[PDB]
């Protein structure tokens, strides 16, 4: 039943040989995507009355 | 136009739609829930299967709980006649397909011709094999993952009464979806104050009871539901009273300075022993209840067995107390 | 046996070690100079009634018209929210029912629940009727997603994760790792990778083909009730039941900001991003709602519409309506 | 001095009654959760107090501080109309609430199905019905004016009106609006004590080794009523029977007594903690 045992210790063996990249891009790639896509947004510029489906 | 006739056929149907549910409203509040809440090997099926007398697949099934038994109580005896059919057992003790032959079953009455059954604390078992080995559809065990439910109508009212089963189950989440549920029906095991639980040293089986008692009568979402408490299994706690084995006070200690209770129904011809337990047991598990509750919660204990009392009076005339004491408290009469 | 134990304690620190080595800067320094957003306000559009018991679960159509609500009174009830019009009532077999779906073909709608049984209907036959019954699992279901007309797949609380096959009622393969209950998951954009929260306070990124996990992240302090997922497809949040919500990273491996307020001291039931992923609304068992900012921490809003929790929530794949459920047998519609 | 200050005191009174019931109303109905099938009657008792200090209370004052009355004989006959029915609705509506109770705490079982919506709109339209039969018709059909020199009279004078009764409609109304739910009342929750004490003795007996709110509510709940109305319904048939004991004085003030229970009842029920909150968010 030490094989369970063994099972997990392959498992992390794979997880820790991976490629990773720096915060700072990840942080400047959801600045590029959000300031990409805010414009069509509802949520954060509301709609006119005249085009608000609900209203 | 043809808008207006699109518009009005989606008007019927939220009105043929909406009839429908009235209907079924008034149905959905004259009904009464239970959840019948307790502990593994107590007995809680059997009061299921009484349930069911108001309102042969199993048989192959008995005799494969009658195999398990035997390969327990066999692989027990290590903690000479027939010793073949001993060392045949071992030979069969885990066979995955199905176990059809009469050799085996033949040999195995022949096994039995012995002082393992006697230990019965020593290692797990189960309890509806001394039957088997020596009503017969309660007797049998089974564990299926589901919710049993079974519907019941007496005097003109509707109860639903439903069990939950966890094989494994531990640290509950699905408990905070009952909420609105009339009462708990708890039940728990007399006779398990000298035995172990799983075959781990665990504790004495009745201490992991009061350890769930604890933790359903603490709960932020059962706050405000009350608790019918049923004290399974009084026939064999009167022979292990009676057998000089299993001392009482020996597993408990705090059984030593208990007296009994000055208020007391002792049953008819009961000596002062056995019913002197009886009532500790019962304290006992009060004591958390007396503790908390504030008003908005009550346990209603019960002296009962099984396989021959009738209990379906007992859970519809407290039934009617819980429903009148919130409607007391709601209009502050109380 | 104890000669294994030596190789995880050397292997577990090289992780944390090689994140430690990636994090040049946190997250709010680099988006200190960004403007905030100011003051979000919404109000109740609709209101929808007709249900008799709490509710669970709720989930939008494709056309973003029609969505569909469960309840433990046994129905399962599509609405229609233009109108405020009942389309169909459902009755169910067991009246215990803890999730929902609905097919992007909007043609099929899942459920399931404390029977360990999921059950598929066919709406576009014209009676309702139960096309198939996959009942080869243990413990209650958390969660039900559709991939395609014939793929589903369902988590559950034997810590375990499966995708089944509709046509053929059999698991085409099987997720385990998981030491506790798992209670949600969603799929990706692209329906290839899909991520799982459980009792453990982890969680993984599994793939559906492959069927073996890629990473694992165990940021958390509790149990975990809800979690979403970033429009982009790099990112997701997480809301567990220590009163605070994660966002993490797939490509860093690393958290990256962290939500949560002393006032607060309830569990989050439910999660959500907006249509640009600028707002994640999260729900609370503290009989409201929250607006906070994905980037920034500051909640900007408060729907406090409500008389009991919030157990389930949505937003319109147009991004034009926020819909909330609650236990008091009553769904709203924010705008 | 006094004469000026005294109506200046009964001022602050109706403001109170006018405010205290357009609270209830209108809490009852923002809120969905303080909806429910006992507070229709709740509800109809708010109504009935506020059209009784909207329409009599000033009017009555009015009449009390000037001598003589101004609108006219038609509009001050019109006045004890509408007088007689609100003080009749208004007595009936707790003895709906109390019969309610009685059905809800003595029979648990079949109280959600005997009580929905439509019997309740049935009985308080029947309620208000009943009520109006015996205030409208025969008030305004002359029928319960009596014959006598001074009551003549005034009957014939324009100048002012005051209230002279035949003993028939006397004796018919003061049984009819006070007498019979009266003693529905008593019985009532004499029976509902009686219960609460059985089950105070048996929780007592359950679990005891190891009765004052019932005694204060009933206490509070009968006798604020009964010491508000009693008095003016036991001098009425009183001051018919006999010759002239009572003067006018006494009369109008023990009327004026009984028109405190209106002002009254908001306070003394509906005091949940869910109509507490409702009241603080609002
Ligand atoms: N002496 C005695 N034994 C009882 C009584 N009621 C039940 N039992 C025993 O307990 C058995 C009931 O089944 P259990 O083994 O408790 O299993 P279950 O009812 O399925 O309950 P779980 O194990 O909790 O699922 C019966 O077959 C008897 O062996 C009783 O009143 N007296
Ligand atoms: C002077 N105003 C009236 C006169 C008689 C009367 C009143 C109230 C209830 C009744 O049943 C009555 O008979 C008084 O409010
Ligand atoms: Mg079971």
């Keep these: 039943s030490i094989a369970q045992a063994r099972k997990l210790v392959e498992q992390l063996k794979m997880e820790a040989n991976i490629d990773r990249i720096k915060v700072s891009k990840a ?21 006119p009355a005249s085009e608000n489906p609900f209203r | 136009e043809d808008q207006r006739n699109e518009e009005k056929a989606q008007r019927e149907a939220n009105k043929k739609i909406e009839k429908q549910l009235q209907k079924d409203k008034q149905v959905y509040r004259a009904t009464h829930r239970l959840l019948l809440l307790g502990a593994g090997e107590s007995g809680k099926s059997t009061i299921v299967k009484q349930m069911r007398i108001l309102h042969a697949t199993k048989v192959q099934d008995i005799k494969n709980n009658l195999k398990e038994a035997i390969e327990t109580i066999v692989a027990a005896m290590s903690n000479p006649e027939n010793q073949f059919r001993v060392d045949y057992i071992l030979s069969v003790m885990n066979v995955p397909d199905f176990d059809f032959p009469p050799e085996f079953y033949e040999h195995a009455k022949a096994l039995w011709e012995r002082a393992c059954y006697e230990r019965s604390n020593e290692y797990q078992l189960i309890d509806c094999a001394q039957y088997f080995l020596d009503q017969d559809l309660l007797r049998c065990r089974v564990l299926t993952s589901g919710i049993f439910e079974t519907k019941f109508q007496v005097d003109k009212v509707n109860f639903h009464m439903f069990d939950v089963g966890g094989q494994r189950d531990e640290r509950r989440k699905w408990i905070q979806c009952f909420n609105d549920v009339t009462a708990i029906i708890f039940v728990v095991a007399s006779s398990s104050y000298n035995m172990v639980i799983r075959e781990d040293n665990q504790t004495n089986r009745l201490q992991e009871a009061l350890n769930l008692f604890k933790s359903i009568w603490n709960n932020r979402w059962l706050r405000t539901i009350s608790v019918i408490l049923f004290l399974n299994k009084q026939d064999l706690l009167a022979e292990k009273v009676l057998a000089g084995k299993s001392k009482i006070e020996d597993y408990f200690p705090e059984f030593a300075r208990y007296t009994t209770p000055e208020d007391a129904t002792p049953e008819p011809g009961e000596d002062p022993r056995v019913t002197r337990a009886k009532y500790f047991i019962r304290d006992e598990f009060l004591r958390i209840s007396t503790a908390s509750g504030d008003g908005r919660h009550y346990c209603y204990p019960h002296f009962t067995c099984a396989v021959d009392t009738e209990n379906i009076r007992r859970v519809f005339n407290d039934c009617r107390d819980i429903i009148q004491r919130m409607h007391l408290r709601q209009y502050e009469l109380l | ?28 320094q680099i988006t200190n100079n960004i403007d905030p957003v100011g003051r979000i306000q919404m109000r109740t559009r609709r209101t929808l009634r007709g249900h008799l018991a709490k509710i669970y679960a709720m989930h939008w159509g494709t056309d973003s018209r029609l969505l569909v609500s469960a309840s433990q009174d046994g129905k399962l009830i599509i609405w229609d929210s233009y109108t405020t019009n009942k389309v169909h009532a459902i009755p169910l077999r067991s009246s215990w029912v803890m999730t929902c779906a609905y097919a992007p073909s909007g043609n099929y709608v899942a459920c399931g629940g404390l029977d360990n049984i999921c059950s598929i209907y066919n709406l576009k036959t014209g009676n309702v009727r139960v096309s198939r019954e996959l009942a080869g699992h243990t413990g209650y279901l958390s969660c039900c997603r559709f991939l395609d007309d014939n793929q589903i797949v369902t988590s559950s609380g034997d810590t375990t994760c499966a995708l089944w096959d509709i046509e053929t009622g059999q698991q085409t393969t099987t997720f385990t790792g998981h030491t506790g209950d798992v209670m949600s998951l969603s799929l990706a954009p692209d329906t290839r990778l899909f991520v799982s929260g459980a009792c453990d306070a982890s969680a993984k990124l599994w793939d559906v083909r492959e069927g073996m996990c890629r990473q694992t992240f165990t940021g958390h302090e509790s149990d975990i009730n809800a979690i979403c997922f970033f429009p982009n497809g790099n990112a997701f949040a997480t809301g567990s039941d220590d009163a605070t919500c994660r966002l993490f990273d797939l490509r860093a491996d690393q958290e990256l900001m962290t939500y949560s307020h002393d006032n607060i001291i309830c569990g989050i039931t439910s999660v959500s991003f907006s249509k640009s992923g600028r707002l994640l609304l999260a729900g609370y068992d503290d009989f409201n709602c929250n607006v906070w900012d994905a980037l920034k921490a500051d909640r900007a809003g408060v729907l406090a519409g409500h008389d009991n929790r919030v157990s389930c929530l949505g937003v319109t794949d147009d991004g034009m309506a926020v819909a909330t459920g609650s236990w008091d047998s009553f769904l709203k519609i924010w705008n | 001095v006094w004469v000026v200050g005294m109506g200046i005191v009964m001022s602050l009174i109706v403001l109170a009654i006018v405010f205290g019931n357009v609270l209830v109303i209108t809490a009852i109905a923002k809120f969905e959760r303080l909806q429910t099938v006992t507070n229709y009657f709740i ?164 679990e005891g080794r190891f009765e004052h709110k019932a005694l204060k509510t009933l206490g509070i709940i009968m006798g604020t009523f009964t010491l508000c109305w009693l008095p003016f319904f036991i001098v009425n048939i009183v001051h018919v029977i006999q010759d002239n004991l009572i003067r006018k004085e006494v009369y109008i003030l023990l009327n004026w007594i009984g028109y405190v229970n209106s002002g009254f009842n908001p306070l003394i029920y509906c005091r949940s903690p869910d109509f507490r909150i409702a009241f603080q968010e609002l």
């Design chain 1, 27 to 47: 942080a400047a790639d959801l600045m590029a995507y959000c300031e990409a896509h805010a414009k069509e947004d509802p949520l954060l510029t509301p709609v």
């Design chain 3, 1 to 28: 046996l104890d000669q294994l134990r030596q190789e995880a304690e050397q292997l577990k620190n090289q992780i944390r070690d090689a994140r430690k080595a990636c994090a040049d800067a946190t997250l709010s």
């Design chain 4, 43 to 206: 509800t109809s008792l708010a109504c009935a107090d506020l059209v009784m200090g909207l329409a009599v209370v000033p009017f009555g004052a009015a009449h009390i501080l000037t001598k003589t009355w101004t609108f006219g004989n038609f509009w001050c006959e019109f006045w004890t109309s509408i007088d007689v029915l609100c003080v009749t609705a208004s007595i009936e509506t707790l003895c709906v609430i109390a019969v309610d109770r009685y059905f809800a705490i003595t029979s648990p079982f079949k109280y959600q199905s005997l009580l929905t919506k439509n019997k309740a709109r049935v009985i308080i339209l029947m309620v208000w019905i009943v009520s109006g039969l015996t205030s409208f018709l025969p008030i305004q059909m002359h029928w319960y004016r009596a014959t006598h020199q001074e009551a003549i009279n005034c009957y014939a004078e324009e100048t002012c009106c005051d209230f002279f009764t035949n003993q028939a409609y006397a004796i018919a109304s003061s049984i009819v609006s006070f007498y019979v739910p009266l003693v529905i009342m008593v019985f009532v929750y004499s029976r509902v004590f009686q219960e609460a004490k059985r089950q105070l003795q048996k929780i007592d007996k359950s």
